[PDB]
């Protein structure tokens, strides 16, 4: 299959110029070896962006506390995303 | 195993039975996937308005791409893992 | 003055005229409040699914409170400003 | 007026124990001097939480690039929040 995605990621600012490129080229490499096709890349260099967000969500709210393995969450993950009855879902793990 | 907290929202539209089955259905998945459900809270139907305020500094990278889920999935995985990635987001049009 | 980028979503429900007025109405507010609109993009009606992935470390503080907006507003302001606050979120039920 | 709110904030982990309390007591102080009423506070101490979020939003999407003063954004801010036609709005500034 194939969908058009847009992706943003942030590299911590402590990383050294050469390392940077290595990681960067690395991730594009990661995308490519799997059939993905990169149409364009932008590098904004180091930035400090403040974001404020505001949303309103109405629905039947459910909260779960769970001990699980990585494998488990993806299953939950996967199935939540497809089901039209689930608007939004969120996961916090301790690290 | 890790501790996890999991939040999800159910369409305001859904009915009692459908709802009821759902919670059950999602409950099973976890557990049949070897997870223990420490605790559950049904907060019922809520309209919550929220405001997120955050500041993130670093090297910003943005890609437009054509990919399937696995390529994406994999990527996600490695970003999650990689130490020098603070954050990342992916969005597709349905 | 600062550079700002501003995103907003319009109910899928809204009609052409209502929509049209809206964009206009919000456009005016900024400008009558002395803002210059560098550029505008109408992406039309989109269904975008998104996934945010982030890790935040620090001292976590959580409060349940009864307050009006100004008390909140003020607080927000000072958190935004204070140097040792990485992030903060506020949620109310409508 | 008065509404019930819940608030979360994170203090950077570099801050020193005594400073901590000072800030903390400070912010409660901030809430109180303005009629707010704190019913409960929890301190989880220093934590590293990973969050993954997933939502789906359908609506007419609008993007603006703008040079504005603080004052301006709040006006935008305020009016967006109330209007039932605006589901979600977001603001990025450079800092
Ligand atoms: Ca879904
Ligand atoms: Ca990471
Ligand atoms: Ca701050
Ligand atoms: Ca609104």
Curated annotation (Swiss-Prot), chains A, D:
Pfam families: Ribosomal_S6. PROSITE patterns: RIBOSOMAL_S6 (PS01048). It comes from the Bacteria. The gene is rpsF. Binds together with bS18 to 16S ribosomal RNA. One of its GO terms (biological process) is translation. Belongs to the bacterial ribosomal protein bS6 family. It comes from Bacillus anthracis. CDD domains: bS6 (cd00473). Keywords: Ribonucleoprotein, Ribosomal protein, RNA-binding, rRNA-binding. PANTHER family: MITOCHONDRIAL 28S RIBOSOMAL PROTEIN S6, SMALL RIBOSOMAL SUBUNIT PROTEIN BS6M. GO terms for molecular function: small ribosomal subunit rRNA binding; structural constituent of ribosome. Transmembrane segments: none annotated. One of its GO terms (cellular component) is cytoplasm. This is Small ribosomal subunit protein bS6. HAMAP family: Ribosomal_bS6 (MF_00360).
């Amino acid at each position: 299959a194939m969908r058009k995605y847009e992706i943003m990621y942030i590299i911590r600012p402590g990383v050294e110029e050469e390392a940077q490129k290595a990681l960067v080229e690395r991730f594009a490499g990661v995308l490519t070896n799997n059939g993905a096709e990169i149409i364009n890349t932008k590098e904004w260099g180091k930035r400090r962006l403040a974001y404020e967000i505001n949303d309103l969500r109405e629905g039947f709210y459910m909260i779960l506390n769970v001990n699980a393995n990585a494998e488990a969450i993806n299953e939950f993950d996967r199935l939540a995303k497809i089901n039209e009855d689930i608007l939004r879902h969120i996961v916090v793990k301790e690290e």
